[PDB]
Write a protein that binds this DNA or RNA. Structure first.
Ligand SMILES: [Mg+2]
Ligand SMILES: [Zn+2]
Ligand SMILES: [Zn+2]
Ligand SMILES: [Zn+2]
Ligand SMILES: [Zn+2]
Ligand SMILES: [Zn+2]
Ligand SMILES: [Zn+2]
Lengths: 56, 137, 100, 142, 65, 127, 44, 88, 138, 351, 114
RNA sequence: AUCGAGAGA
DNA sequence: CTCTCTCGATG
C-alpha cells in the first residue's frame, strides 16, 4: 500500500467462482495485473465506519 | 482476458484439458515413553476421550484408520490416536483431521513399524483438480 | 564428488589425523546400506523402503584398530558406488519400485 | 458474423502452474487468537486473519477515516479493558469485580480508580516496559 | 498416461485410433503425418491430440503392485 | 472420466427420459441405461480394456440405445484401459440422458465447418 | 481388519496387537485393503 | 597491471557433497577420537551415535557443522529435493 | 550449464616430480639476475622454481593430459607475456569440455581433430546400444 | 464484551515515562520470589511459593486467581519482585550512568562548576533537558579537582559491565554516590523529582513480570528469571557462608551478567548468553525491536478479523466502484445488524 | 468450490419464471423482456427476426453477464401494435422457416448415397 | 508457537 | 535499514 488509492471502498457484488472480480479501470491505482495477483478485503462492523468508507 | 489473464474453452476443460491428480500424505506415529507409556491407534468414543475433534470419526475403522476408497471432506478425521495421561476420561485425543479447506478420496493407507519399533502410518489422499477461473497458467 | 569422498577422502580423514596414546587406526570399510531393526535382525535397506518407512539410507563404517569396530553410519548418495541402484538394470529398478 | 481483423491462431505449448485459487482463497470472521498477544493467528490453514500492516494504517490516515482505523485496531483485533490507578498511573490495580473492590497496594487507592480500553498488545508493551524498570504512567487528564 | 479418448478442441473420438496409429508407424512404415491423415485426422487439433501424446501407461505397467 | 466420454447409441434417445424428470428413485429403465464392465489381466502380455467390453445390463425394452459406438476397424472401439497380469477392473456404469450444454461428453457433433461469402463481397473482414 | 503386503501378493488379516511383518516374506511394509462400501463417480 | 578481478569465476571454487561431508566427518571423527581419549584415560565401548546422529542432523536441518548456531552456514546447505517436475 | 563439471581433485606430487625431472630449476637454486627470462612454474598456488624453454614442457604436459597420463581434470595455464606457468590440481574448479583444434593437417589447414569417422563410430555405439566419450577424451 | 465495572470509562490523555524506584517496586509487588522452581514441586501439579505464584496469576483455566478471582481472561497481570544480594547496573543506562559519574565528582556529590563559572551559567540556561545534559556533560568531564571536598576526580572508562577508576568502582559505591546528589542537582541534568532519579537507574530490586508476559505451552523469560534467581541464591550462599575474596566477586559479576542480558541480549559484549537448546534466547529488547517487534508488528499494524484474501480477475461487466466477492467469502464474512422496524422482516428471512 | 451447477444454465430455478415482461419507462410503447436460462442462440435469432417486421421501431438483445444464462430483449413498436404480438409473429415466423428447412433438408437427404 | 529454507507480485 | 502462502527440521 504505497498511496491512499491502494485502499478504496467498493460496493459488494456477490458472484460465483473463487476470484475477486474488479473493474479494469481500477487496475491503475491499485497497480495490479491478473497474472496471479492477490488482494485483501476488509469489512466494517458499525454504521459510522461503513459511513466513513462510503463517504470518504 | 485483459492485464495478463486468459479465457479458456470450458468444453475442452470438460474433455480433460489441463486436469490434474493431487496426492497428499499425512504421517502419524505412536509415541513411546520411559515407563512403557504408548499412544495407540483406535477409533475413540466421546465418553472415553478428552477434547476430541469437531469433525466426525464415523469413517474410521477398528484400527483407527480410513479404508482407501472412502470419500473425505471438510474436517473429517483420517487417523485416530489417543494418549493416556478408576477415573472418567482417561484418554487425550491426538487424532489427525483432514485439511479444513481440502477434500477428496483416500487413495492408499500405509501401516509400518519404525526403526525404533514404533507403529506409524502414512495416509495418502487423492483429489482430481480441474482448471477453474483463477488457476495460474 | 561423493565417490571421491568415499574412495579416498574418508581414509585420509581417519588415518592421517588420528592416533592415540596406544591405538592406531587402520583401513576403513564402507558396507552396503543396511538397517538394524528393533527386532534385532539387521538387513539390507533399499531406497524405496527407506523413504516409505522414514528410515535413513546409510551404510556402516568399520575401522581396523591396533595396539573390526563400528564407528557410525554414513548416509549414502543414491546411484553412487555403495548404492544398490548403481549396478541395477532397468528391470531391476522397476522391481525395486525405483523410477528408471 | 465474421471478425474484421484476423486472429493469430495456432498450437502453443502451455503449462499449468501450482498456484490455484482454491488453495489461495481465504476468509475469516472472528477466529482463533494467539496466546501472547491475543491477536488473530497466522496462516490460512489455521484459520487466521490478515495483517493490517503499517502501510494500510498510513493509507487510512491519508483518507482520514479515524473510526475505521480504531475499529481495525480494537474490535477487529485485540480489544482489552484495563484498570488504572488514579495516583501513580500503572496497572497495579487489583480489580475485584462483582464486589466492586478496586484495590491498589502501594498507594492505598480504593475510590480514585479508572478504566480504559487499549489493545492487549499495548498492555503487553506496558507490562514489558514495567519489567524493564520503566514506568509508562497513564493519566486520563490534561 | 494413456491416449486421450476424445480431442479437447473439437471433440472427435481419437482414443480408438492409437493402436492403429502405432501400426501405421511400424507395420506399414509410414511417417507420422500420413499415419495421422489415414486415420481421418484432418484438423490439426486432433492431429495434435494423437501426435503430441506420450503413452506413459506402458511404463506404469512395469510395476508389480 | 474416460467412461464419461465414451460415445453411446442415442438413436431412440427421444423416448428415453431425464432422470430429473422421471418419477423413480435415483434411476430406472425409463430414464437410464445400466452397463457393466468386468476386466482382468489374464495373459502375460498387456490385457487391453476397450469400449466393446462394456455389457448392457438394464432392460432396453425395444429401444435402440446404450450400445457403445464402435467405428474401429478391428471392432474394439475406444481404448479404455490397460491391465498388467493380475490387475482387475470391476465397475458398473449408469448412463443418463444429458445435454452438451451441461457437459461436453453429451456432444453429438464434433467440428461444424461454417463459411459465408468466400469472396468477402460483403466486406465483413478487413484482410 | 485385513491388510495386504507391498512387495508380494498376499492377504494378511492380522488385526491389532500383530501388525508387522508379513506371512512368508519378511518385509514390514503393509498397505490397507480397499473398502467394501462402494463409492460413486460423476463421470464428468 | 590493473586491479585483480574478484568476480573471476576461475579464481572461485564449488564445494559439493565431497568437501562438505569431509569437513563434517573430520569434525565428528575428531570429536569421536576425543571422546574415546576420555574413555581411555578414564580407565570396545565406542560411541558410534556421534558420527551417525551428527551426519543425520546436518543432512536433515541443512545447518552444516553439528549443533552450534554460531555457524554461518545457516543458509541451508541440504534442502528437500524438489519433485514437482522432472525438470525441477 | 549442461556440460559443466566440478574438479574432484587429484595428487599434484607426480606432476611435481615430473617437472623437477624435466628441467625445472629448484626455487632455492634460482638466481634472478642470471636468468630473467625464466618462466616461473606454479602448482596449486605454490612456486616450485623457474624453467627455461617453457614451450617444450607445455607441449609435453598437454600431450600427457590428452593421452591420459595426466588427469584430464588437471588444468594447465601457460601465460606467455607474463612468463608464468600455473598448473592447478585444485578441487572445486568448474570446467567444461571443448573440441581440440590442431594444425597437424598436411593436406589442409587448422582443422578439428575429431572427424566424421569418430562421429560414425559414436552413432554406431548408439545404434548398437564400444566407442564412448572416454575414448574421445583419451 | 467482558463485564460491567463500577469504574468510569476514561481516555488516556498523557503518558509520563519514568524510572522504577525500588521502594515503589517492592510496594507494588504482591508476591515475593524466593524459590527458583517453576511450577511443579515434588511431583505436584501446582505452584511453589517462589516463582509463578497463584498470586501473580493462576494458569490452569480456573475460576480463581489471587482472591480477586475473575478467571484468567479478565485478570491482566499481577507483578512480583525480587531483591538482589547486591545492586547491579541497568544495561540500557550503562552509558547515561557513566556520564553522570563524570558530571559529579566522587565521595562528595556536587556539580563541578556553578554560577561562579561563566560557561556553566550559559550551559545551565537551556530549558530542554537533553540539550542541557549534553551541554553540561562536555563542559564538566574535563574537571579533575573541585561547596568543597577537593578530591581528584578519576578517569572513568567502560569495561564489560563494571566501571574503573584512574587517579574499579563498585555498584554499591555508585549507589551511595547517586544517593547524595540531592534534588537541586537533578534538575540541572534532566532528571525529575518523584519520577526519575539516578539513584533508581541502578537495580536494587527488580520487578517480576506476570505469567501473561511469559506464558507456557516454558517461556525464555522464565528461564532467564530462573538464572537470575539462581545467581542470586548462589551469591547469597557464597556471602553468608564461606566468603573467599576472589569467589563472591565472580558471583556478583554473574548476577550482573544475567540481569543485564535479561533485558538486552544484543550488546557489544561477545557473550550472548545462549540457552539449553543452543538458542541465543529472546530478551525483552528483542521483543520490541521491529519490524517483527511488538511496536511495529502488534501495535502499528496487526492481524484483524472480518478480512478476506483472493486471486483477482478483471470483469468488463462490473462497475468501477464494485468488487466481485466469491459466495463462500460472502457466507464467511459477516456484519452485525441491529433489529429495527425497518428491517425486521428481511433480517428474519436471513435468519 | 464456488462454481455453480451446470444445469443452472438451462433449468429454471426456484420461482424463476421463463419470461419477465416489463414496461419500459424511457421510450413510449416499449418493453423489456427478461429471458431466463437462454443465451445468444435464442436472443440473436429473435432480435434478427424482429428487424424484419417493418412495424417494429427498436429491437435489441443483450447478455448482461456471461456467468448467468439470461438475456434482456428490448422491443419498441409503432402505436396501435402491441410488442407481444411482434414477438409472437417473430417466433411463429422462425418456427415456420425451421419447419420448411427441416422438410427441405429431409427431402434433400433422401436423394443421397453413401 | 521459536529459528532456518523454498516460493508468490 | 529491508505482504503472502508454504514446506521441515527443532524444543
Ligand atoms: Mg503480477
Ligand atoms: Zn498506584
Ligand atoms: Zn479436434
Ligand atoms: Zn427413472
Ligand atoms: Zn510379503
Ligand atoms: Zn487476578
Ligand atoms: Zn568531591
Amino acid at each position: 500500500s504505497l498511496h491512499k488509492m491502494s485502499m478504496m471502498a467498493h460496493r459488494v457484488k456477490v458472484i460465483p467462482y473463487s476470484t475477486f472480480r474488479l473493474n479494469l479501470s481500477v487496475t491503475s491505482p491499485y497497480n495490479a495485473d491478473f497474472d496471479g495477483d492477490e488482494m485483501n478485503l476488509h469489512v466494517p462492523q458499525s454504521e459510522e465506519t461503513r459511513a466513513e468508507l462510503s463517504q470518504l | 482476458n485483459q492485464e495478463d489473464s486468459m479465457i479458456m474453452n470450458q468444453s475442452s476443460i470438460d474433455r480433460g484439458l489441463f486436469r490434474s491428480l493431487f496426492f497428499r500424505s499425512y504421517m502419524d506415529q505412536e509415541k513411546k515413553y520411559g515407563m512403557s507409556i504408548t499412544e495407540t491407534f483406535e477409533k475413540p468414543q466421546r465418553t472415553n476421550t478428552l477434547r476430541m475433534k469437531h469433525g466426525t470419526y464415523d469413517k474410521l475403522d477398528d484400527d483407527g484408520l480410513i479404508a482407501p476408497g472412502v470419500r473425505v471432506s471438510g474436517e473429517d478425521v483420517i487417523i485416530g490416536k489417543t494418549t493416556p495421561i478408576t477415573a472418567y476420561h482417561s484418554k487425550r485425543d491426538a487424532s489427525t483431521p483432514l485439511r479444513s479447506t481440502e477434500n477428496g478420496i483416500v487413495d492408499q493407507v500405509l501401516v509400518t513399524t519404525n526403526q525404533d519399533g514404533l507403529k506409524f502410518v502414512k495416509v495418502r489422499v487423492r483429489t482430481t483438480k480441474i482448471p477453474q477461473i483463477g488457476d495460474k497458467f | 564428488s561423493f565417490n571421491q569422498f568415499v574412495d579416498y577422502t574418508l581414509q585420509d580423514i581417519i588415518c592421517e589425523d588420528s592416533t592415540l596414546i596406544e591405538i592406531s587406526f587402520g583401513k576403513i570399510y564402507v558396507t552396503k546400506p543396511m538397517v538394524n531393526e528393533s527386532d534385532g535382525v539387521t538387513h539390507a535397506l533399499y531406497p524405496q523402503e527407506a523413504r516409505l518407512r522414514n528410515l535413513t539410507y546409510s551404510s556402516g563404517l568399520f575401522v581396523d584398530v591396533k595396539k573390526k569396530v563400528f564407528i557410525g553410519r554414513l548416509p549414502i548418495m543414491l546411484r553412487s558406488k555403495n548404492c544398490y541402484l548403481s549396478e541395477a538394470t532397468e528391470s531391476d529398478l522397476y522391481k525395486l519400485k525405483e523410477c528408471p | 458474423k465474421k471478425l474484421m481483423a484476423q486472429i493469430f491462431f495456432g498450437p502453443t505449448y502451455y503449462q499449468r502452474l501450482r498456484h490455484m485459487v482454491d488453495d489461495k482463497i481465504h476468509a475469516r470472521a472472528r477466529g482463533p487468537m494467539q496466546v501472547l498477544t491475543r491477536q488473530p493467528v497466522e496462516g490460512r490453514s489455521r484459520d487466521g486473519g490478515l495483517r493490517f500492516g503499517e502501510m494500510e494504517r498510513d493509507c487510512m490516515i491519508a483518507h482520514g477515516a479515524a473510526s475505521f482505523l480504531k475499529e481495525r485496531l480494537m474490535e477487529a483485533s485485540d480489544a482489552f479493558r484495563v484498570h488504572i490507578c488514579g495516583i501513580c498511573g500503572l496497572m497495579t490495580v487489583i480489580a475485584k469485580l462483582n464486589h466492586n473492590q478496586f484495590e491498589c497496594k502501594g498507594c492505598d487507592n480504593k475510590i480514585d480508580i479508572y478504566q480504559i480500553h487499549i489493545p492487549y498488545a499495548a498492555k503487553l508493551l506496558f507490562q514489558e516496559l514495567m519489567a524493564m524498570n520503566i514506568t509508562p504512567r497513564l493519566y486520563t487528564d490534561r | 498416461m494413456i491416449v486421450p479418448v476424445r480431442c479437447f478442441s473439437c471433440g472427435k473420438v481419437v482414443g480408438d485410433k492409437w493402436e492403429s496409429y502405432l501400426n501405421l508407424l511400424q507395420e506399414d512404415e509410414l511417417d507420422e503425418g500420413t499415419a495421422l491423415s489415414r486415420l481421418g485426422l484432418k484438423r490439426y487439433c486432433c492431429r495434435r491430440m494423437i501426435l503430441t501424446h506420450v503413452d506413459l501407461i506402458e511404463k506404469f505397467l512395469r510395476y508389480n503392485p | 472420466h474416460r467412461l464419461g466420454l465414451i460415445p453411446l447409441q442415442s438413436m431412440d434417445i427421444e423416448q428415453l427420459e431425464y432422470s430429473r424428470d422421471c418419477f423413480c428413485e435415483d434411476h430406472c429403465d425409463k430414464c437410464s441405461v445400466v452397463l457393466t464392465l468386468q476386466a482382468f489381466g489374464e495373459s502375460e502380455s498387456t490385457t487391453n480394456v476397450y469400449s466393446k467390453d462394456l455389457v448392457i445390463v438394464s432392460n432396453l425394452m425395444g429401444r435402440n440405445i446404450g450400445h457403445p459406438i464402435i467405428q474401429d476397424k478391428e471392432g474394439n472401439g475406444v481404448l479404455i484401459c490397460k491391465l498388467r497380469k493380475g490387475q482387475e477392473l470391476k465397475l458398473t456404469c449408469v448412463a443418463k440422458k444429458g445435454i452438451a450444454k451441461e457437459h461436453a461428453k453429451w456432444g453429438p457433433a464434433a467440428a461444424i465447418e461454417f463459411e459465408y461469402d468466400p469472396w468477402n463481397k460483403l466486406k465483413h473482414t478487413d484482410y | 481388519l485385513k491388510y495386504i503386503c507391498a512387495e508380494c501378493s498376499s492377504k494378511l488379516s492380522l488385526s491389532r496387537t500383530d501388525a508387522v511383518r508379513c506371512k512368508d516374506c519378511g518385509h514390514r511394509i503393509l498397505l490397507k485393503a480397499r473398502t467394501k462400501r462402494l463409492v460413486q463417480f460423476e463421470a464428468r | 597491471k590493473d586491479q585483480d578481478d574478484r568476480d573471476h569465476f576461475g579464481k572461485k571454487r564449488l564445494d559439493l557433497a565431497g568437501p562438505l561431508l569431509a569437513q563434517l566427518f573430520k569434525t565428528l571423527f575428531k570429536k569421536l577420537t576425543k571422546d574415546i581419549f576420555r574413555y581411555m584415560q578414564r580407565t570396545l565401548a565406542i560411541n558410534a551415535k556421534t558420527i551417525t546422529s551428527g551426519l543425520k542432523y546436518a543432512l536433515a536441518t541443512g545447518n552444516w557443522g553439528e549443533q552450534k548456531k554460531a555457524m554461518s552456514s545457516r543458509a541451508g546447505v541440504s534442502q528437500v529435493l524438489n519433485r514437482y517436475t522432472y525438470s525441477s | 550449464s549442461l556440460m559443466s563439471c566440478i574438479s574432484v581433485g587429484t595428487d599434484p606430487m607426480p606432476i611435481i616430480t615430473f617437472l623437477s625431472e624435466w628441467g625445472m630449476e629448484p626455487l632455492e637454486d634460482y638466481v634472478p639476475h642470471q636468468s630473467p627470462d625464466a618462466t616461473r612454474v606454479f602448482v596449486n598456488g605454490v612456486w616450485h622454481g623457474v624453467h627455461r624453454n617453457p614451450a617444450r614442457l607445455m607441449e609435453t604436459l598437454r600431450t600427457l593430459r590428452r593421452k591420459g597420463d595426466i588427469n584430464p581434470e588437471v588444468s594447465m595455464i601457460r601465460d606467455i607475456r607474463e612468463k608464468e606457468l600455473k598448473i592447478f590440481t585444485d578441487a572445486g574448479r568448474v570446467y567444461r569440455p571443448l573440441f581440440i583444434v590442431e594444425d597437424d593437417e598436411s593436406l589442409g589447414h587448422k582443422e578439428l581433430k575429431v572427424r566424421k569417422g569418430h562421429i560414425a563410430k559414436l552413432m554406431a555405439t548408439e545404434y548398437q546400444d564400444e566407442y564412448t566419450w572416454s575414448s574421445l577424451l583419451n | 464484551g467482558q463485564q460491567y465495572s463500577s469504574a468510569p470509562l476514561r481516555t488516556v490523555k498523557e503518558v509520563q515515562f519514568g524510572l522504577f524506584s525500588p521502594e515503589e517496586v517492592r510496594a507494588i509487588s504482591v508476591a515475593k520470589i524466593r524459590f527458583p522452581e517453576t511450577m511443579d514441586e515434588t511431583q505436584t501439579r501446582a505452584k511453589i511459593g517462589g516463582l509463578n505464584d497463584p498470586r501473580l496469576g493462576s494458569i490452569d483455566r480456573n475460576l480463581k486467581c489471587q482472591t480477586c478471582q475473575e478467571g484468567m481472561n479478565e485478570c491482566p497481570g499481577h507483578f512480583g519482585h525480587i531483591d538482589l544480594a547486591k545492586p547491579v547496573f541497568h544495561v540500557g543506562f550503562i552509558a547515561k550512568i557513566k556520564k553522570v559519574c563524570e558530571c559529579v565528582c566522587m565521595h562528595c556529590g556536587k556539580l563541578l562548576l556553578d554560577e561562579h563559572n561563566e560557561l556553566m551559567r550559559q550551559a545551565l540556561a537551556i530549558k530542554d533537558s537533553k540539550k542541557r545534559f549534553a551541554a553540561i556533560w562536555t563542559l564538566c568531564k574535563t574537571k579533575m579537582v573541585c561547596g568543597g571536598c577537593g578530591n581528584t576526580q578519576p578517569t572513568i572508562r567502560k569495561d564489560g559491565l563494571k566501571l574503573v577508576g584512574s587517579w574499579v568502582l563498585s555498584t554499591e559505591e555508585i549507589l551511595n554516590i547517586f544517593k547524595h546528589i540531592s534534588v537541586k542537582d537533578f534538575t540541572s541534568l534532566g532528571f525529575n523529582e518523584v519520577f526519575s532519579r539516578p539513584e533508581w537507574m541502578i537495580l536494587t530490586c527488580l520487578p517480576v513480570p506476570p505469567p501473561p508476559v511469559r506464558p507456557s505451552i516454558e517461556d525464555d523469560l522464565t528461564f532467564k528469571l530462573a538464572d537470575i534467581l539462581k545467581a542470586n541464591i548462589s551469591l547469597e550462599t557464597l556471602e553468608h557462608n564461606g566468603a573467599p575474596h576472589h569467589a563472591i566477586e565472580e558471583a556478583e559479576s554473574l548476577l550482573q551478567f544475567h540481569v543485564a542480558t535479561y533485558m538486552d541480549n544484543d550488546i557489544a559484549g561477545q557473550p550472548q548468553a545462549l540457552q539449553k537448546s543452543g538458542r541465543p534466547v529472546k530478551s525483552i529488547r528483542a521483543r520490541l525491536k521491529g519490524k517483527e517487534g511488538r511496536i511495529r508488528g502488534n501495535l502499528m499494524g496487526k492481524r484483524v478479523d472480518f478480512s478476506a484474501r483472493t486471486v483477482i480477475s478483471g470483469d468488463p461487466n462490473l462497475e468501477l466502484d464494485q468488487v466481485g466477492v466469491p459466495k463462500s467469502i460472502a457466507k464467511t464474512l459477516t456484519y452485525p445488524e441491529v433489529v429495527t422496524p425497518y428491517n425486521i422482516d428481511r433480517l428474519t428471512q436471513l435468519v | 468450490m464456488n462454481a455453480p451447477d451446470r444445469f443452472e444454465l438451462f433449468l429454471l430455478g426456484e420461482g424463476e419464471s421463463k419470461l419477465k415482461i416489463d414496461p419500459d419507462t424511457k421510450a413510449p410503447n416499449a418493453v423489456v423482456i427478461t429471458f431466463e436460462k437462454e443465451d445468444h442462440t435464442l436472443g440473436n435469432l429473435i432480435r434478427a427476426e424482429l428487424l424484419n417486421d417493418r412495424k417494429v421501431l427498436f429491437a435489441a438483445y443483450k447478455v448482461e453477464h456471461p456467468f448467468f444464462a439470461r438475456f434482456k430483449l428490448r422491443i419498441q413498436t409503432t402505436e396501435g401494435y402491441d410488442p407481444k404480438d411482434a414477438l409472437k409473429n417473430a417466433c411463429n415466423s422462425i418456427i415456420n422457416k425451421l419447419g420448411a428447412l427441416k422438410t427441405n433438408f429431409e427431402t434433400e437427404w433422401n436423394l443421397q448415397t453413401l
